[PDB]
RNA sequence: GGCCCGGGGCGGUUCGAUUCCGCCCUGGGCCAG
């Protein structure tokens, strides 16, 4: 039953003593190092508030800087500090560059920011993290394990991150929800009544109807914390809460096995579906996931849309990434359409336009039907693949700055066996609802 | 980089395009780190 299951679950989300101590001695050594240089800092993030999920230990140290400092000064002293304070350092880049490293074995993030009083005057998102901590540090005390269960849940089912690869619930959003509902269970029990029009103003301890799913930042009434959450993902969650409440289980907190299918079975299935299944392969632009994916979607979409307006009756799109390449997969209901198709002309009454409509020499001689003229034209392509090779070769520019640039220079369309050998059998099964 | 909203030019396609497919400049807003 519910309580039972949550009890054995705490064992998958709560970090064990050796993992907790390791983090401690790290926080310990790090505080020492920063103090021996006396820098004005503050630990924030799930580690600060002991809400981090077992296996995801990371300390996030924030360096407070005067309001007048020029951004550049913040990066330079920020880089300097991290340098002298870390065992190993490697510069990373978000809205502004920062340093990421390791101390006594654990991950550490060193982010520069402005020490400020009162939400406005914030220049970057980083400048808000400090507040979010101050606001969260007092109210979350005594619920960490709830935050954890809830993170483990979302993670287990692939919707925990808030980056563009997941488009799920950011950690902050998670804690914000525990603070509102009081515990994991109350959260799950209430999410079942969530709609795409639901608003959640933690600050006013209220819930209302809006024009989109909106969780208002306690610190900033205009910022939506769940801003990046995909409508579908929001759905999957509600549905996950309804199923969990109906039949609790520990399986909801255990990641689902990759479950890979032998290419031969997968070939039969597509044969059984009798659809056109092909992919568009091209070299992965060497860029960060936050830019790669929003592009892959655009790409997948433009092509999906080229496909349906072209009457190839697309059923689902999908994409995958690799160190090596990128695959835009598709499945159409039409392997081959006719060459002739009908075009709509003007109404018989409109002599002018009709005349011009007939000035176009065509191979088939247009006819009348229901008052207006029609014509028979010939397609430039007759299969989905044939068409996608056309759309891509000429519209690459509209498939995302980077993705589109790599497609322009090189890309190929795959299919058949040659396809179930590529590193994409998994997505294809998801795309096709393959089960068992 | 992506999304949203808005200006000024174009190209293609069409009997017919502000209205489909796209490209230039270009103003504001938002998202991820």
Coordinates of C-alpha atoms (C1' of nucleotides) in Angstrom, one line a residue:
Chain A
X1 CA 0.0 0.0 0.0
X2 CA 1.1 3.6 -0.4
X3 CA 2.9 4.2 2.9
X4 CA 4.5 0.8 2.6
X5 CA 5.9 1.4 -0.8
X6 CA 7.1 5.0 0.0
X7 CA 8.9 3.4 3.0
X8 CA 11.1 1.2 0.8
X9 CA 11.4 4.0 -1.7
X10 CA 13.3 6.3 0.7
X11 CA 16.0 3.7 0.2
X12 CA 16.4 4.7 -3.5
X13 CA 16.2 8.5 -3.1
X14 CA 18.0 9.2 0.2
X15 CA 21.8 9.3 -0.1
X16 CA 23.6 6.8 2.2
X17 CA 26.0 7.8 5.0
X18 CA 29.2 7.3 3.1
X19 CA 27.8 9.4 0.3
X20 CA 26.6 12.0 2.8
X21 CA 29.9 12.1 4.7
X22 CA 31.9 12.3 1.4
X23 CA 29.8 15.4 0.7
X24 CA 30.4 16.8 4.2
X25 CA 34.2 16.5 4.2
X26 CA 34.0 18.2 0.7
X27 CA 31.9 21.1 2.0
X28 CA 34.3 21.1 4.9
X29 CA 37.5 21.4 2.9
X30 CA 35.9 23.8 0.4
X31 CA 34.8 26.2 3.2
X32 CA 38.3 26.1 4.5
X33 CA 39.9 26.9 1.1
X34 CA 37.6 29.8 0.4
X35 CA 38.1 31.2 3.9
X36 CA 41.9 31.0 3.7
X37 CA 41.4 33.6 0.9
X38 CA 38.4 35.1 2.7
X39 CA 36.0 35.3 -0.2
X40 CA 32.4 36.3 0.2
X41 CA 30.5 33.1 -0.7
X42 CA 27.3 31.1 -0.1
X43 CA 26.3 27.5 -0.7
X44 CA 23.0 27.1 -2.5
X45 CA 21.3 24.3 -4.5
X46 CA 20.0 20.9 -3.3
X47 CA 23.2 20.2 -1.4
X48 CA 22.9 23.3 0.7
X49 CA 19.3 22.2 1.6
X50 CA 20.1 18.5 1.8
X51 CA 17.5 17.7 -0.9
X52 CA 19.9 16.3 -3.4
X53 CA 18.9 12.9 -4.8
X54 CA 21.1 9.9 -3.9
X55 CA 23.8 9.6 -6.5
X56 CA 23.6 13.2 -7.7
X57 CA 25.9 14.9 -5.1
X58 CA 27.1 18.3 -6.4
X59 CA 27.9 21.4 -4.3
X60 CA 27.0 24.7 -5.8
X61 CA 29.1 27.5 -4.4
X62 CA 28.1 31.1 -5.2
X63 CA 30.5 34.0 -4.9
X64 CA 28.8 37.3 -3.9
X65 CA 30.0 40.4 -5.7
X66 CA 29.3 44.1 -5.2
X67 CA 26.6 45.7 -7.2
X68 CA 29.0 48.1 -9.1
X69 CA 31.4 45.4 -10.4
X70 CA 31.5 45.2 -14.2
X71 CA 30.4 41.7 -15.3
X72 CA 33.9 41.0 -16.7
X73 CA 35.4 41.6 -13.3
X74 CA 33.0 38.9 -12.0
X75 CA 34.2 36.4 -14.6
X76 CA 37.9 37.2 -14.1
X77 CA 37.9 37.1 -10.3
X78 CA 35.4 34.3 -10.5
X79 CA 37.8 32.3 -12.7
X80 CA 40.7 33.2 -10.5
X81 CA 39.0 32.1 -7.3
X82 CA 37.7 28.8 -8.7
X83 CA 41.2 28.1 -10.1
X84 CA 43.1 28.5 -6.8
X85 CA 40.3 26.7 -4.9
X86 CA 39.7 23.5 -6.9
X87 CA 41.7 20.3 -7.3
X88 CA 40.7 20.3 -11.0
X89 CA 39.0 23.1 -12.9
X90 CA 37.2 23.3 -16.2
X91 CA 35.4 26.4 -17.4
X92 CA 31.7 25.9 -18.4
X93 CA 29.1 28.3 -19.9
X94 CA 25.5 29.1 -19.1
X95 CA 24.3 32.8 -19.3
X96 CA 27.8 33.7 -18.2
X97 CA 30.9 31.6 -17.9
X98 CA 31.6 29.8 -14.7
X99 CA 34.0 27.2 -13.3
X100 CA 33.2 23.6 -12.6
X101 CA 35.5 21.3 -10.6
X102 CA 36.3 18.6 -8.0
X103 CA 37.2 18.9 -4.3
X104 CA 37.9 15.9 -2.0
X105 CA 36.2 13.8 -4.7
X106 CA 32.9 15.7 -5.2
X107 CA 31.5 17.8 -8.0
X108 CA 31.5 21.6 -7.3
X109 CA 30.1 24.5 -9.2
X110 CA 31.6 27.9 -8.8
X111 CA 29.2 30.6 -9.9
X112 CA 29.9 34.3 -9.8
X113 CA 27.0 36.7 -9.0
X114 CA 25.9 40.1 -7.5
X115 CA 25.2 40.4 -3.7
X116 CA 21.9 42.2 -3.8
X117 CA 19.0 43.3 -1.6
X118 CA 15.5 42.8 -3.1
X119 CA 14.6 40.7 -6.3
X120 CA 14.6 43.7 -8.7
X121 CA 18.2 44.8 -9.7
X122 CA 18.8 41.3 -10.8
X123 CA 20.8 41.3 -14.0
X124 CA 21.1 37.5 -14.7
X125 CA 19.1 34.4 -13.6
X126 CA 22.1 33.5 -11.4
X127 CA 21.4 36.7 -9.4
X128 CA 18.0 35.1 -8.5
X129 CA 19.4 31.8 -7.3
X130 CA 20.6 33.4 -4.0
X131 CA 17.0 34.6 -3.2
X132 CA 15.4 31.3 -4.2
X133 CA 17.7 29.8 -1.6
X134 CA 16.9 32.3 1.1
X135 CA 13.2 31.8 0.5
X136 CA 13.5 28.0 0.4
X137 CA 15.9 27.4 3.2
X138 CA 13.5 28.2 6.0
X139 CA 10.4 26.5 4.6
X140 CA 11.8 23.3 3.3
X141 CA 13.4 22.2 6.6
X142 CA 12.0 18.9 7.7
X143 CA 10.7 17.8 4.3
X144 CA 13.9 17.1 2.3
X145 CA 12.9 13.4 2.0
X146 CA 9.7 14.4 0.4
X147 CA 11.5 16.6 -2.1
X148 CA 13.7 13.6 -2.8
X149 CA 10.9 11.0 -3.2
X150 CA 9.3 13.4 -5.7
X151 CA 12.6 13.9 -7.6
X152 CA 13.2 10.2 -7.7
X153 CA 9.7 9.7 -9.1
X154 CA 10.2 12.2 -12.0
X155 CA 13.6 10.9 -12.7
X156 CA 12.6 7.3 -12.7
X157 CA 10.0 8.2 -15.4
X158 CA 12.3 10.4 -17.5
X159 CA 10.9 13.9 -16.7
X160 CA 13.1 15.3 -13.9
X161 CA 15.5 17.7 -15.6
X162 CA 14.4 21.2 -16.8
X163 CA 17.0 21.5 -19.5
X164 CA 15.9 21.3 -23.1
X165 CA 16.6 17.5 -23.3
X166 CA 13.9 16.7 -20.7
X167 CA 11.6 19.7 -20.5
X168 CA 10.4 18.5 -17.1
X169 CA 10.4 19.7 -13.5
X170 CA 13.5 21.7 -12.4
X171 CA 14.7 20.9 -8.9
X172 CA 13.5 24.3 -7.6
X173 CA 10.0 23.6 -9.0
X174 CA 10.1 20.3 -7.1
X175 CA 10.9 21.8 -3.7
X176 CA 8.4 24.6 -4.4
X177 CA 5.7 21.9 -4.8
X178 CA 6.6 20.1 -1.6
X179 CA 6.4 23.5 0.2
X180 CA 2.9 23.9 -1.3
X181 CA 1.4 20.4 -0.9
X182 CA 3.3 19.5 2.3
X183 CA 4.6 16.1 1.0
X184 CA 5.2 13.9 -1.9
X185 CA 1.9 12.1 -1.5
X186 CA -0.2 15.3 -1.3
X187 CA 1.6 16.4 -4.4
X188 CA 0.8 13.3 -6.3
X189 CA -2.8 13.2 -5.0
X190 CA -3.3 16.8 -6.2
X191 CA -1.5 16.6 -9.5
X192 CA -4.3 14.2 -10.6
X193 CA -6.5 17.3 -10.7
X194 CA -4.1 19.3 -12.7
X195 CA -5.1 20.6 -16.1
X196 CA -3.2 22.6 -18.8
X197 CA -4.9 25.7 -17.4
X198 CA -3.8 25.3 -13.8
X199 CA -1.9 28.1 -12.0
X200 CA 0.0 27.6 -8.7
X201 CA 0.9 30.8 -6.8
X202 CA 2.9 29.4 -3.8
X203 CA 3.2 32.9 -2.4
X204 CA -0.5 33.4 -2.1
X205 CA -1.0 29.8 -1.1
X206 CA -3.6 29.7 -3.8
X207 CA -4.5 27.7 -6.9
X208 CA -6.4 29.2 -9.9
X209 CA -7.2 28.9 -13.6
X210 CA -4.8 30.6 -16.0
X211 CA -4.1 30.7 -19.7
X212 CA -1.4 28.0 -19.3
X213 CA 0.2 25.8 -16.6
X214 CA 1.9 28.3 -14.3
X215 CA 3.8 28.0 -11.0
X216 CA 4.6 31.6 -9.9
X217 CA 8.0 32.1 -8.5
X218 CA 7.8 33.1 -4.8
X219 CA 10.5 35.6 -5.5
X220 CA 9.1 37.0 -8.7
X221 CA 5.4 37.1 -9.5
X222 CA 6.0 37.3 -13.3
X223 CA 8.4 34.4 -13.6
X224 CA 6.9 31.0 -14.3
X225 CA 9.0 28.3 -12.6
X226 CA 7.5 25.5 -14.7
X227 CA 8.0 27.7 -17.8
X228 CA 10.0 25.1 -19.7
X229 CA 7.8 22.1 -19.0
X230 CA 6.3 20.5 -22.1
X231 CA 2.5 20.1 -22.3
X232 CA 2.9 16.4 -23.0
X233 CA 5.3 15.9 -20.1
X234 CA 2.9 17.7 -17.9
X235 CA 0.3 15.2 -19.1
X236 CA 2.5 12.2 -18.5
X237 CA 2.9 13.3 -15.0
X238 CA -0.8 13.8 -14.2
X239 CA -1.4 10.4 -15.7
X240 CA 1.5 9.0 -13.6
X241 CA 0.0 10.3 -10.4
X242 CA -3.4 8.8 -11.2
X243 CA -1.8 5.4 -11.9
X244 CA 0.4 5.5 -8.8
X245 CA -2.5 6.4 -6.6
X246 CA -4.5 3.5 -8.1
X247 CA -1.8 0.8 -7.7
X248 CA 1.2 2.0 -5.7
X249 CA 4.4 0.2 -6.5
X250 CA 8.2 0.5 -6.0
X251 CA 8.5 0.1 -9.8
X252 CA 7.6 3.8 -10.2
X253 CA 11.0 4.7 -8.6
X254 CA 13.1 2.3 -10.5
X255 CA 14.3 3.4 -14.0
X256 CA 12.8 1.3 -16.8
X257 CA 15.3 -1.1 -18.4
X258 CA 16.3 -0.1 -22.0
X259 CA 14.5 -3.3 -23.2
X260 CA 16.2 -3.7 -26.6
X261 CA 14.6 -5.6 -29.5
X262 CA 16.4 -7.8 -32.0
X263 CA 16.4 -6.0 -35.4
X264 CA 14.6 -9.0 -37.0
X265 CA 11.5 -8.7 -34.9
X266 CA 11.5 -4.9 -35.4
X267 CA 11.5 -5.5 -39.2
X268 CA 8.5 -7.8 -39.0
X269 CA 6.6 -5.2 -37.0
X270 CA 7.1 -2.4 -39.5
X271 CA 6.1 -5.0 -42.1
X272 CA 3.0 -5.7 -40.1
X273 CA 2.3 -2.0 -39.9
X274 CA 3.0 -1.7 -43.6
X275 CA 4.1 1.9 -43.2
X276 CA 7.1 3.9 -44.5
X277 CA 9.8 4.1 -41.9
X278 CA 12.9 6.0 -42.7
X279 CA 15.4 8.3 -41.0
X280 CA 17.4 11.4 -42.0
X281 CA 21.0 10.9 -40.9
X282 CA 23.5 13.8 -40.6
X283 CA 26.6 14.7 -38.5
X284 CA 26.0 16.0 -35.0
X285 CA 26.8 19.7 -34.8
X286 CA 29.5 19.9 -32.1
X287 CA 27.3 22.0 -29.7
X288 CA 25.7 21.8 -26.3
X289 CA 22.5 19.8 -25.8
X290 CA 20.6 23.0 -24.9
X291 CA 21.0 24.2 -28.5
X292 CA 21.1 20.9 -30.3
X293 CA 17.8 19.6 -29.2
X294 CA 15.6 22.7 -29.7
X295 CA 17.0 22.5 -33.2
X296 CA 16.4 18.8 -33.7
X297 CA 12.8 19.4 -32.8
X298 CA 12.4 22.2 -35.3
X299 CA 14.0 20.1 -37.9
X300 CA 11.9 17.0 -37.1
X301 CA 8.8 19.3 -37.2
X302 CA 9.5 21.2 -40.4
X303 CA 9.8 17.8 -42.1
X304 CA 6.8 16.4 -40.4
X305 CA 4.9 19.3 -41.7
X306 CA 6.4 19.0 -45.2
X307 CA 5.3 15.4 -45.0
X308 CA 1.6 16.0 -44.1
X309 CA 1.0 18.9 -46.4
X310 CA 2.5 16.6 -49.0
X311 CA -0.2 14.0 -48.2
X312 CA 2.2 11.4 -47.0
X313 CA 0.1 11.0 -43.9
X314 CA 2.8 11.1 -41.1
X315 CA 2.0 9.2 -38.0
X316 CA 4.9 10.2 -35.6
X317 CA 8.2 11.9 -35.7
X318 CA 11.2 11.3 -33.4
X319 CA 14.9 12.1 -33.1
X320 CA 18.1 10.8 -31.5
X321 CA 21.6 12.1 -30.9
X322 CA 25.1 10.6 -30.8
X323 CA 28.8 11.5 -30.3
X324 CA 28.7 10.7 -34.0
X325 CA 25.4 11.6 -35.7
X326 CA 21.8 12.6 -35.4
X327 CA 18.7 10.8 -36.7
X328 CA 15.4 12.3 -37.6
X329 CA 13.0 9.4 -37.7
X330 CA 9.6 9.2 -39.3
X331 CA 6.7 6.9 -40.1
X332 CA 4.2 7.6 -42.8
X333 CA 1.1 5.8 -43.8
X334 CA 1.9 6.3 -47.5
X335 CA 4.9 4.5 -49.0
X336 CA 3.9 5.6 -52.5
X337 CA 1.3 8.1 -53.7
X338 CA 0.1 8.6 -57.3
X339 CA 1.9 10.8 -59.7
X340 CA -1.2 12.7 -60.8
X341 CA -3.1 14.7 -58.2
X342 CA -5.9 17.3 -58.6
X343 CA -5.6 21.1 -58.3
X344 CA -8.4 23.5 -57.6
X345 CA -9.2 26.1 -60.2
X346 CA -11.6 29.1 -60.1
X347 CA -15.4 29.0 -60.4
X348 CA -16.9 28.8 -64.0
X349 CA -18.5 32.3 -63.6
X350 CA -15.0 33.9 -63.3
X351 CA -14.2 34.0 -67.0
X352 CA -11.0 36.0 -66.4
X353 CA -9.4 33.6 -64.0
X354 CA -10.6 30.5 -65.7
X355 CA -9.1 31.7 -68.9
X356 CA -5.7 32.0 -67.2
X357 CA -6.3 28.7 -65.4
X358 CA -6.6 27.1 -68.9
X359 CA -3.7 29.0 -70.4
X360 CA -1.4 26.6 -68.5
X361 CA -0.7 23.8 -70.9
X362 CA -1.0 20.5 -69.0
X363 CA -0.8 16.9 -70.1
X364 CA -4.3 16.1 -69.0
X365 CA -7.0 18.7 -69.8
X366 CA -8.8 20.1 -66.8
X367 CA -12.5 19.4 -66.1
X368 CA -15.5 20.9 -64.3
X369 CA -17.1 19.6 -61.1
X370 CA -19.5 21.3 -58.7
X371 CA -19.3 24.7 -60.5
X372 CA -15.5 25.1 -60.5
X373 CA -12.6 24.1 -62.7
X374 CA -10.0 21.5 -61.7
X375 CA -6.8 20.2 -63.2
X376 CA -4.6 17.1 -62.9
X377 CA -1.0 17.8 -62.1
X378 CA 2.1 15.6 -61.7
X379 CA 4.1 15.3 -58.5
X380 CA 7.9 15.8 -58.5
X381 CA 8.1 12.9 -56.0
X382 CA 6.0 9.9 -55.1
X383 CA 7.4 8.4 -51.9
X384 CA 8.0 10.0 -48.6
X385 CA 11.8 9.5 -48.8
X386 CA 12.0 10.8 -52.3
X387 CA 10.3 13.9 -51.0
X388 CA 12.3 14.4 -47.9
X389 CA 15.5 14.3 -50.0
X390 CA 13.9 17.1 -51.9
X391 CA 12.8 19.2 -48.9
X392 CA 16.1 18.8 -47.0
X393 CA 18.4 19.5 -50.0
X394 CA 16.6 22.8 -50.6
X395 CA 15.2 23.9 -47.2
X396 CA 18.1 23.0 -44.9
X397 CA 18.4 26.6 -43.9
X398 CA 15.0 26.4 -42.2
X399 CA 16.0 23.4 -40.0
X400 CA 17.9 25.3 -37.4
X401 CA 21.1 27.4 -37.7
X402 CA 23.4 24.5 -36.7
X403 CA 21.4 21.4 -37.4
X404 CA 20.5 22.9 -40.8
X405 CA 24.2 23.8 -41.6
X406 CA 25.3 20.2 -41.1
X407 CA 22.4 18.9 -43.1
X408 CA 23.3 21.2 -45.9
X409 CA 26.9 19.9 -46.1
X410 CA 25.9 16.3 -45.7
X411 CA 23.0 14.0 -44.9
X412 CA 21.4 10.8 -46.2
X413 CA 18.1 9.0 -45.9
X414 CA 18.1 5.5 -44.4
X415 CA 15.5 2.7 -44.4
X416 CA 14.8 -1.0 -44.5
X417 CA 17.3 -3.3 -42.8
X418 CA 20.1 -0.8 -43.2
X419 CA 17.9 1.2 -40.8
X420 CA 17.3 -1.4 -37.9
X421 CA 21.1 -1.5 -37.7
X422 CA 21.6 2.1 -36.8
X423 CA 21.7 3.2 -33.1
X424 CA 18.0 4.1 -33.1
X425 CA 16.0 0.8 -32.6
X426 CA 15.0 2.1 -29.2
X427 CA 13.4 5.4 -30.2
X428 CA 11.6 3.7 -33.1
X429 CA 9.9 1.3 -30.7
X430 CA 8.8 4.3 -28.5
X431 CA 7.7 6.1 -31.7
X432 CA 5.7 3.0 -32.7
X433 CA 4.2 2.1 -29.4
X434 CA 5.9 -1.4 -29.7
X435 CA 5.1 -3.2 -26.5
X436 CA 6.0 -6.4 -24.5
Chain B
rG1 C1' 20.7 28.7 -30.0
rG2 C1' 14.8 27.8 -29.6
rC3 C1' 9.9 29.8 -28.8
rC4 C1' 6.3 34.0 -28.7
rC5 C1' 4.6 38.9 -30.7
rG6 C1' 5.6 43.0 -34.4
rG7 C1' 7.7 46.1 -38.3
rG8 C1' 10.2 47.0 -43.8
rG9 C1' 11.9 44.7 -48.0
rC10 C1' 12.2 40.4 -51.5
rG11 C1' 12.1 35.2 -54.1
rG12 C1' 9.2 30.8 -55.4
rU13 C1' 4.5 28.6 -56.1
rU14 C1' -0.7 29.7 -57.5
rC15 C1' -6.3 31.5 -61.7
rG16 C1' -5.7 34.2 -57.4
rA17 C1' -1.0 35.3 -51.8
rU18 C1' -1.1 39.9 -46.6
rU19 C1' -3.4 34.5 -46.5
rC20 C1' 0.8 28.7 -48.8
rC21 C1' 6.6 27.4 -49.1
rG22 C1' 10.9 30.2 -48.0
rC23 C1' 15.1 34.5 -47.6
rC24 C1' 17.0 39.1 -46.3
rC25 C1' 17.3 43.2 -42.9
rU26 C1' 14.7 44.5 -38.4
rG27 C1' 11.8 46.2 -32.8
rG28 C1' 10.1 43.9 -28.1
rG29 C1' 9.1 39.8 -25.0
rC30 C1' 10.3 34.7 -23.1
rC31 C1' 13.1 29.7 -22.2
rA32 C1' 17.6 26.4 -21.1
rG33 C1' 22.5 26.4 -18.6

